Amino acid sequence: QYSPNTQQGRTSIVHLFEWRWVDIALECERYLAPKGFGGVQVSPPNENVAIYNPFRPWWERYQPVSYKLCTRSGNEDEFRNMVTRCNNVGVRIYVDAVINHMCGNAVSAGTSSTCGSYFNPGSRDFPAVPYSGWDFNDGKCKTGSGDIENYNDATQVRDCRLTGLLDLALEKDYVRSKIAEYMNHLIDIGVAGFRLDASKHMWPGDIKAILDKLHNLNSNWFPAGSKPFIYQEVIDLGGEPIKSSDYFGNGRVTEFKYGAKLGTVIRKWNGEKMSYLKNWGEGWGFVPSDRALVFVDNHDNQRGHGAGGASILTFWDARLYKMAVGFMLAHPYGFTRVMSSYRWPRQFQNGNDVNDWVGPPNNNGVIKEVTINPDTTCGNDWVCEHRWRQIRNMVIFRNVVDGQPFTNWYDNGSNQVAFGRGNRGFIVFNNDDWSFSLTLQTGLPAGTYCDVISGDKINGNCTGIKIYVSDDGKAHFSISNSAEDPFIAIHAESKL
Ligand SMILES: CO[C@H]1[C@H](O)[C@@H](O)[C@@H](O[C@H]2[C@H](O)[C@@H](O)[C@@H](O[C@H]3[C@H](O)[C@@H](O)/C(=N/O)N[C@@H]3CO)O[C@@H]2CO)O[C@@H]1CO
Ligand SMILES: *[C@@H]1O[C@H](CO)[C@@H](O)[C@H](O)[C@H]1NC(C)=O
Ligand SMILES: [Ca+2]
Ligand SMILES: [Cl-]
Numbered sequence: 247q248y249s250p251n252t253q254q255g256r257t258s259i260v261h262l263f264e265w266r267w268v269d270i271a272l273e274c275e276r277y278l279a280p281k282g283f284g285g286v287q288v289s290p291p292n293e294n295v296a297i298y299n300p301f302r303p304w305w306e307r308y309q310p311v312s313y314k315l316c317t318r319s320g321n322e323d324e325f326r327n328m329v330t331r332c333n334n335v336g337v338r339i340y341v342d343a344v345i346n347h348m349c350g351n352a353v354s355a356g357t358s359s360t361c362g363s364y365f366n367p368g369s370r371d372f373p374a375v376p377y378s379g380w381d382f383n384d385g386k387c388k389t390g391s392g393d394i395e396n397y398n399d400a401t402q403v404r405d406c407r408l409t410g411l412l413d414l415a416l417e418k419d420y421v422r423s424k425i426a427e428y429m430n431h432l433i434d435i436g437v438a439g440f441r442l443d444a445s446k447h448m449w450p451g452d453i454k455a456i457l458d459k460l461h462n463l464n465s466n467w468f469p470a471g472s473k474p475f476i477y478q479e480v481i482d483l484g485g486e487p488i489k490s491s492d493y494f495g496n497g498r499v500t501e502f503k504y505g506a507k508l509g510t511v512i513r514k515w516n517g518e519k520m521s522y523l524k525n526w527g528e529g530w531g532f533v534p535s536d537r538a539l540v541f542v543d544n545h546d547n548q549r550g551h552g553a554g555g556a557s558i559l560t561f562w563d564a565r566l567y568k569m570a571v572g573f574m575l576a577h578p579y580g581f582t583r584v585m586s587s588y589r590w591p592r593q594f595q596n597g598n599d600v601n602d603w604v605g606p607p608n609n610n611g612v613i614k615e616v617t618i619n620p621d622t623t624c625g626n627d628w629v630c631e632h633r634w635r636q637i638r639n640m641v642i643f644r645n646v647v648d649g650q651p652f653t654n655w656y657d658n659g660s661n662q663v664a665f666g667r668g669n670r671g672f673i674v675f676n677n678d679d680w681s682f683s684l685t686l687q688t689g690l691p692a693g694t695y696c697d698v699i700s701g702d703k704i705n706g707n708c709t710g711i712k713i714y715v716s717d718d719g720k721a722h723f724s725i726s727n728s729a730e731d732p733f734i735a736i737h738a739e740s741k742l
Pocket of ligand 3: 346403404405413414447
C-alpha cells in the first residue's frame, strides 16, 4: 500500500485535474520527466454521467456509469498511450478510482453519458458494467431518506448514499469482483496505484477484500512483486467516530488535517503562527508519516467542496500558497501531492462561490488543450501551479533532500522560521509583517548556493538570490516582508 512506486529519487505526484490524456502524455515527456516529478494523479478515467444542468461541471466525473475507459479526457487508446509514454519516461500514473458508488439516484435514465452507455438510476440498472438492483445498498441502509444524514453513525456513512449517490454493495463478491476487474485492467495497462475516492464511505474490510484481488504492477515497467500504491481518501478532521487509522491495513490515507492546519497557520488565524510548526506532523495529531498522503489543497476544498474550511490556501492566494507548498515540500512528513488546477470565474455571494461547479476550460463542452507559453506557464486558463518556478524547484528540493532528517530548526517566536534537511538542504520563511535579517546555521557545506525560489542555477550561475555558507555552516539570510516570495530555499544541487 504504502510505497508510491515512483522512480527512485522522485518524491511527489501532481494532480493534473481534468487534464486530457494526450496533454498528460506530452507533459510527462516535456516537463514532468526532466523536472523530476514522481507521477500524476489523473481524473476518473471511467465513463461518467454527462451533466448539462449545470453545464458539464467538474463533479460529473464522480458519478460513474460504467468502467469503460471513455471520458472527456480521452478513450482507452488515448489512456493507454498516456500511461505507456509516461512510464517510458519514468513518470507514474495514479488513477482516481470512484468505486464507492455509481451516479446520483435522481439522475434521469438514458444515454447522457461520456461513452453513450445506457443507464437507469431509478431502476438501479447499469448494463454496461453490469450492475442491477441487487448490487446496491438500498436494502442495507437504515436511514429514512436512504442518504447519509448523520456522520455520528459510522454505519450509515458506509451503507447509505453519499449526497444521493447510488451506494454499491461492496460486501458482495460480485461487486468487489467487478471493481477489481476494472482496477486490474488499469494495472495491466501500467498504472502504479490509485486514489480510492470516498474511502470513508467504504468499510475498511470491503476495501481490503477488493485489494486482495488486485494484480501486481505491470512487469514490463516495474520489478516483480510490486504492489500498487494505495492512498485512500478519508476526510477525517476529528470530531467524528470514523478514524482514518481504521484504514491503515489497506494503504495510505489522505491527511486533510494537514492542509486545513497549514492554512490556518500561514493565514495566521486564531493566533496561530509559523513558530508553532516546529513539531509539525504527528505532533499535530496527524496520522503516521508513512501512512500519509499530504497536500495544501485538493480538487474539492480549493473550491469549498470537501473539508478544510476557508483556511485552505489555493492558487488564488498565490503568494501565501507558494509558501505553504514550499513548507510542505521541504518538510519530511508524508508523501507529497502537488495540485495543478484550472481557472474558473469565482463569484462569491453571501460567502460562497456560486460558480464552484464550473468544469475545466472548454469549447462547447470539449476540454481545451493545455498550451505552453514561452515563459513556461500555461495558456487556455490552466493554472499549472506545478510549473511555477517556486513550486517546481521545491519539488526538486524534496528529491535532493530525500531521506535527510529534519534539523537546525530556527524561529523568532513569531512567524519567521527556518530548518534544514540533514546536510542537503535549508529553507527560510518570513511570514511576519517585518523584515528578517539574520545569520543561521544551515548544516550545509561551505560554498555559494542559488536560492531556488527567486531564481535558478543555470550555466554555473544563479539567476536570483545567492546565499554564502561559511566554513562553520552559517549563512546570512535577508527576507523583507514585502518580498515577492517571503522565503528562500537552497540545496546540494543549487550549489555553485
Ligand atoms: C442531489 O445531490 C447532487 C449534488 O447536489 C451535486 O453537486 C453532485 O454531487 C457532487 C459533489 O458536490 C462534488 O463535490 C463531488 O463529490 C465527490 C468529491 O469530489 C470526492 O473527492 C469525494 N470524496 O469523498 N466524494 C464525492 C463523490 O465522489 O461529486 C459529486 C457527484 O457529482 O451530485 C449529487 C447526486 O446527484
Ligand atoms: C556566469 O556568469 C558570468 C557573467 O555574469 C560569466 O562571466 C561566467 O562565465 C558565467 N559562468 C559560467 C560557468 O558560465
Ligand atoms: Ca458506501
Ligand atoms: Cl483527495
